[PDB]
Enzyme design. Structure first.
Site, PDB file in Angstrom:
ATOM      1  N   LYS A   1      20.532  57.302  40.634  1.00  0.00           N
ATOM      2  CA  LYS A   1      19.670  56.342  41.315  1.00  0.00           C
ATOM      3  C   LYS A   1      20.012  54.918  40.909  1.00  0.00           C
ATOM      4  O   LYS A   1      20.242  54.053  41.762  1.00  0.00           O
ATOM      5  CB  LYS A   1      18.206  56.628  40.997  1.00  0.00           C
ATOM      6  CG  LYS A   1      17.684  57.934  41.516  1.00  0.00           C
ATOM      7  CD  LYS A   1      16.177  57.947  41.482  1.00  0.00           C
ATOM      8  CE  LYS A   1      15.643  57.855  40.072  1.00  0.00           C
ATOM      9  NZ  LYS A   1      16.209  58.894  39.183  1.00  0.00           N
TER      10      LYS A   1
ATOM     11  N   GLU B   1      11.047  50.768  34.019  1.00  0.00           N
ATOM     12  CA  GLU B   1      12.373  51.294  33.732  1.00  0.00           C
ATOM     13  C   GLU B   1      12.848  50.766  32.385  1.00  0.00           C
ATOM     14  O   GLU B   1      12.269  49.841  31.816  1.00  0.00           O
ATOM     15  CB  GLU B   1      13.368  50.924  34.839  1.00  0.00           C
ATOM     16  CG  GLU B   1      13.632  49.432  34.977  1.00  0.00           C
ATOM     17  CD  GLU B   1      14.908  49.131  35.728  1.00  0.00           C
ATOM     18  OE1 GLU B   1      15.490  50.067  36.309  1.00  0.00           O
ATOM     19  OE2 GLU B   1      15.333  47.958  35.734  1.00  0.00           O
ATOM     20  N   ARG B   2      13.924  51.361  31.880  1.00  0.00           N
ATOM     21  CA  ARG B   2      14.419  51.013  30.556  1.00  0.00           C
ATOM     22  C   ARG B   2      14.758  49.530  30.481  1.00  0.00           C
ATOM     23  O   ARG B   2      15.350  48.966  31.401  1.00  0.00           O
ATOM     24  CB  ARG B   2      15.652  51.848  30.222  1.00  0.00           C
ATOM     25  CG  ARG B   2      15.473  53.346  30.402  1.00  0.00           C
ATOM     26  CD  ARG B   2      16.790  54.065  30.228  1.00  0.00           C
ATOM     27  NE  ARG B   2      16.697  55.487  30.519  1.00  0.00           N
ATOM     28  CZ  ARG B   2      16.555  55.991  31.737  1.00  0.00           C
ATOM     29  NH1 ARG B   2      16.485  55.188  32.785  1.00  0.00           N
ATOM     30  NH2 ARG B   2      16.487  57.301  31.908  1.00  0.00           N
TER      31      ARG B   2
HETATM   32  N1  LIG Z   1      29.053  56.825  40.823  1.00  0.00           N
HETATM   33  C1  LIG Z   1      29.089  57.535  39.676  1.00  0.00           C
HETATM   34  N2  LIG Z   1      30.244  58.031  39.195  1.00  0.00           N
HETATM   35  C2  LIG Z   1      30.300  58.742  38.053  1.00  0.00           C
HETATM   36  N3  LIG Z   1      29.220  59.010  37.304  1.00  0.00           N
HETATM   37  C3  LIG Z   1      27.996  58.574  37.669  1.00  0.00           C
HETATM   38  C4  LIG Z   1      27.863  57.794  38.901  1.00  0.00           C
HETATM   39  N4  LIG Z   1      26.567  57.490  39.025  1.00  0.00           N
HETATM   40  C5  LIG Z   1      25.916  58.025  37.967  1.00  0.00           C
HETATM   41  N5  LIG Z   1      26.771  58.666  37.157  1.00  0.00           N
HETATM   42  C6  LIG Z   1      26.392  59.371  35.914  1.00  0.00           C
HETATM   43  O1  LIG Z   1      24.981  59.279  35.753  1.00  0.00           O
HETATM   44  C7  LIG Z   1      24.646  58.542  34.583  1.00  0.00           C
HETATM   45  C8  LIG Z   1      23.745  57.385  34.963  1.00  0.00           C
HETATM   46  O2  LIG Z   1      22.690  57.872  35.771  1.00  0.00           O
HETATM   47  P1  LIG Z   1      21.590  56.854  36.318  1.00  0.00           P
HETATM   48  O3  LIG Z   1      21.817  56.682  37.788  1.00  0.00           O
HETATM   49  O4  LIG Z   1      21.549  55.654  35.417  1.00  0.00           O
HETATM   50  O5  LIG Z   1      20.258  57.718  36.089  1.00  0.00           O
HETATM   51  P2  LIG Z   1      19.030  57.722  37.114  1.00  0.00           P
HETATM   52  O6  LIG Z   1      19.693  57.874  38.453  1.00  0.00           O
HETATM   53  O7  LIG Z   1      18.249  58.927  36.683  1.00  0.00           O
HETATM   54  O8  LIG Z   1      18.328  56.410  36.894  1.00  0.00           O
HETATM   55  C9  LIG Z   1      25.924  58.041  33.951  1.00  0.00           C
HETATM   56  O9  LIG Z   1      25.978  58.402  32.573  1.00  0.00           O
HETATM   57  C10 LIG Z   1      27.039  58.705  34.719  1.00  0.00           C
HETATM   58  O10 LIG Z   1      27.685  59.693  33.912  1.00  0.00           O
HETATM   59 MG   LIG Z   2      17.294  54.614  36.229  1.00  0.00          MG
END
Ligand SMILES: Nc1ncnc2c1ncn2[C@@H]1O[C@H](COP(=O)(O)OP(=O)(O)O)[C@@H](O)[C@H]1O
Ligand SMILES: [Mg+2]
Lengths: 54, 161, 47, 120, 156, 272
Positions: B5, B31-32
């Protein structure tokens, strides 16, 4: 000819087995020495700790 | 959690917002704080936030997850107010990114029991739908302006129901 | 209570992993064959 | 960063084709995956210095252990360290201080692993 | 104290007869265990803080006596009687350098003698049955079993 | 587990049951067709075997070269077909090599190869795959015999192991001896047969080899389809039992979840 020449050139260095044995026995002596020193230290510390803790 | 996300929304800010003439607003809701600082610095590097001149193209509002529920339940409304003003008076296109809009609901749920309301459904406030509607109904493209709203919505435990 | 398509791999039990591997091995083999053919075509079309 | 990246890719590929147990390519892929898996195991209250981890993971991922049986990998691991920790302290100090596997460091690591594998 | 001579192992594995690998492998393993123990054992025994230990004991005299007896008394050390394998080296000095070396060199010499004797011979286009009779006694049709023509067995 | 775990598991097992029922129906249709085709092939193969049981031939006791052929298929999910075939094949190979022979192996179908690729991995003269996709014909037997004869392992004795089809529910594993002309010529019984040079007899041996391979193929495919039908029936029955148990568990869990959420609401309401 090649077989014999290489056989000789190889059996020249048969001394590694004895060199092993040498350093291995040196290692055995060293470990015995280390255990002796640590055993004496442990015993003295044990008596001192007995006195102090009581 | 952990599906992309934040990365996806950052990618959208990288694309659309960078090459977008109008303004832009980012509301971090529960959020963080690490991510808030990272975004601040990434924008400063990119240039949308200019600390020297008056050419900044992004307005940021933050109410991270260290805040008491009262502030998380309202930082969305603060960002929404900034976006609404840019929509009306400025009479221009706006983007409005929110991350996440589930923390608004959750923060509303952390105080309902103390306000004397019987809980509903899976321990949510009885006013979940009304409280969410009275907010999501101001994020709209009226005939006076135009808000493109991107919202990140946490789904507790992958449960879309 | 009903059943829907693509549920064996939604559970992720043992049949799900078994099916995933049965698919991956086959398509790894076919990718190898197609890559060999692609190399052969490359060489034969260089001229 | 240099070594764990390739290890991560190798385990990611291995996990896809692991549920079963033919051709040379995928058979060797499974072999490498299993070698790395038995490499990653560890004991209790014996954390390893980062350079030692790098040495072990490098040996494992540069196809050296692919000859060994997997049940024996742990042996190698342990033994290897007790060797490098005494004879080649200088190399580990180099890796720690410079914080990278330079070309000369890589060539050394290569010769150390090649020599040790045969002698074991 | 310690400065152990380095060992190559791929070379060590080149000089063990099949009848002897069962002791070579055990020597390797027992060296391994000794090396691991030596690494485990510290470079030095940890120091002591006799002042403090004597400063928290009512009978400081008794612990002082312990300290002094420690100062006077040391520990013994083992010797080389178990290392009698010394003798073995001398025996090898005979095989690899006196018996095996000399016999191997004599065999080598014979092998060259044969080599040049075989290399230095006339082109076959002029040679004769007699030439192959001398150089290669395998072509000699033994009359001691096949007198009458063709000497070589008719069934061949 | 939780309610979602149970729901996903129940859906997966329901899909598995559907698939196994469909596979039972397909296997039953193919079995009917294969039995229908097996009758004429049964008579044909029995006739082709006729000679060796009419003029009894004892294999020579001074030869070491042997061949083991094992008819099965590529398809799995057929129960103890490939297992029985490979088990008896390795039994025979061990017996021969203990008595002192030079055995080879020909595997008609992957599964035999796979079962025997750990041990006997070097005795594979040649193995055939692509079996079982379509009903075997005389073309397949001719191809197998041709690639056996061409591969110049002139054998001195032979055996073929296949699953003779007894009844829709039962089958037996057979061993049918295959002889070479070196044995047929050197048989007192063959002295009677007229106009029997060593060339017409060689062509006859080649044809009989093709015949026995074809007979084994038809019997094996019939028994394999029957076994697949039986295995799918049992798998569907087991999936049905598991579905019943999981449905009971799912109902219990659903009721428990309703009660739990309701008690939470009640406690919150009464705790104001
Ligand atoms: N486009 C991408 N390519 C590779 N890995 C990704 C990508 N998007 C997210 N990730 C993986 O997801 C993690 C980050 O997720 P994040 O989107 O920050 O969490 P959330 O969606 O729950 O807020 C990263 O550590 C990475 O490994
Ligand atoms: Mg997030």
């Amino acid at each position: 000819i090649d077989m014999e020449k290489s056989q000789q050139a190889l059996v020249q260095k048969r001394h590694y087995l004895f060199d092993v044995q040498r350093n291995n026995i040196a290692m055995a002596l060293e470990v015995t020495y280390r255990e002796r020193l640590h055993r004496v230290y442990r015993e003295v510390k044990n008596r001192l700790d007995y006195h102090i803790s009581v | 959690a952990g599906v992309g996300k934040t990365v996806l929304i950052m990618e959208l800010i990288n694309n659309v917002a960078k090459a977008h003439g109008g303004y832009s607003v980012f509301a971090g809701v529960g959020e963080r704080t690490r991510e808030g600082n990272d975004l601040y610095h990434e924008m400063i590097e990119s240039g949308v936030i200019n600390l020297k001149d008056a050419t900044s193209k992004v307005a940021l509002v933050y109410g991270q997850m260290n805040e008491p529920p009262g502030a998380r339940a309202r930082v969305a409304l603060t960002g929404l107010t900034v976006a609404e003003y840019f929509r009306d008076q400025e009479g221009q296109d706006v983007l409005l990114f929110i991350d996440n809009i589930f923390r608004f609901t959750q923060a509303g749920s952390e105080v309902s029991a103390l306000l004397g309301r019987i809980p509903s459904a899976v321990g949510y406030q009885p006013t979940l739908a009304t409280d969410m509607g009275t907010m999501q109904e101001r994020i709209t493209t009226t005939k006076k302006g135009s808000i493109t709203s991107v919202q990140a919505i946490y789904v507790p435990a992958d449960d879309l129901t | 209570v009903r059943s829907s398509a693509g549920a064996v791999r939604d559970a992720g039990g043992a049949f799900g992993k078994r099916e995933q591997a049965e698919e991956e091995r086959y398509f790894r083999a076919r990718a190898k064959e197609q890559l060999a053919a692609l190399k052969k075509h490359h060489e034969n079309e260089i001229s | 960063k240099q070594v764990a990246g390739t290890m991560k890719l190798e385990l990611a590929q291995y996990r896809e084709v692991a549920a079963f147990a033919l051709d040379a390519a995928t058979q060797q892929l499974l072999s490498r995956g299993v070698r790395l898996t038995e490499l990653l195991k560890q004991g209790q209250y014996s954390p390893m210095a980062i350079e030692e981890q790098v040495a072990v993971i490098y040996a494992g991922v540069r196809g050296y252990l692919d000859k060994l049986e997997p049940s024996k990998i742990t042996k190698f691991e342990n033994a290897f360290l007790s060797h490098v920790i005494s004879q080649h302290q200088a190399l580990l100090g180099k890796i720690r201080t410079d914080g990278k596997i330079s070309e000369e460091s890589d060539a050394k690591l290569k010769e150390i692993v090649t020599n040790f594998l045969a002698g074991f | 104290k310690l400065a152990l001579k380095t060992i190559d192992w791929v070379a060590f594995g080149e000089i063990i007869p099949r009848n002897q690998k069962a002791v070579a492998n055990s020597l390797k393993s027992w060296n391994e265990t000794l090396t691991s123990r030596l690494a485990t054992l510290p470079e030095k025994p940890p120091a002591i803080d006799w002042a403090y230990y004597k400063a928290n004991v009512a009978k400081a005299g008794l612990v002082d006596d312990f300290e002094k007896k420690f100062n006077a008394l040391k520990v013994p050390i083992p010797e080389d009687k178990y290392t009698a394998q010394v003798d073995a080296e001398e025996k090898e000095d005979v095989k690899s350098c006196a018996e095996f070396l000399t016999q191997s060199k004599t065999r080598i010499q014979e092998y060259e003698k044969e080599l040049e004797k075989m290399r230095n011979i006339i082109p076959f286009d002029q040679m004769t049955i007699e030439d192959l009779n001398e150089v290669f006694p395998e072509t000699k049709l033994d009359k001691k079993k096949y007198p009458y023509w063709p000497h070589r067995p008719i069934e061949t | 587990a939780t309610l979602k775990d149970i729901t996903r598991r129940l859906k997966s097992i329901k899909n598995i049951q559907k698939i196994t029922k469909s596979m039972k129906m397909v296997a039953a249709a193919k079995y009917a067709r294969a039995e229908r085709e097996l009758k004429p092939a049964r008579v044909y193969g029995v006739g082709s075997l006729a000679l060796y049981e009419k003029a009894d031939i004892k294999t020579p006791e001074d030869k070491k070269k042997h061949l083991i052929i094992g008819v099965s298929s590529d398809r799995g999910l057929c129960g103890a077909i490939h297992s029985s075939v490979a088990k008896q094949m390795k039994s025979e190979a061990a017996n021969l090599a203990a008595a002192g022979k030079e055995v080879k192996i020909i595997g008609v179908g992957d599964k035999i190869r796979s079962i025997l690729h750990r041990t006997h991995s070097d005795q594979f003269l040649v193995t055939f795959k692509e079996v079982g996709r379509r009903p075997p014909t005389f073309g397949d037997a001719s191809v197998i015999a041709l690639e056996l004869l061409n591969s110049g392992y002139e054998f001195d004795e032979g055996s073929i192991i296949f699953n003779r089809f007894r009844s829709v529910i039962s089958y037996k594993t057979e061993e049918k001896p295959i002889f070479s002309l070196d044995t047929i010529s050197s048989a007192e019984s063959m002295s009677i047969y007229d106009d029997i040079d060593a060339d017409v007899l060689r062509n006859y041996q080649e044809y009989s080899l093709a015949n026995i391979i074809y007979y084994s193929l038809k019997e094996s495919t019939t028994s394999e389809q029957s076994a697949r039908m039986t295995a799918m029936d049992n798998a569907s029955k087991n999936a049905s039992e598991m579905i019943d148990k999981l449905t009971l568990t799912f109902n219990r869990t659903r009721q428990a979840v309703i009660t739990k959420e309701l008690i939470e609401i009640i406690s919150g309401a009464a705790a104001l």
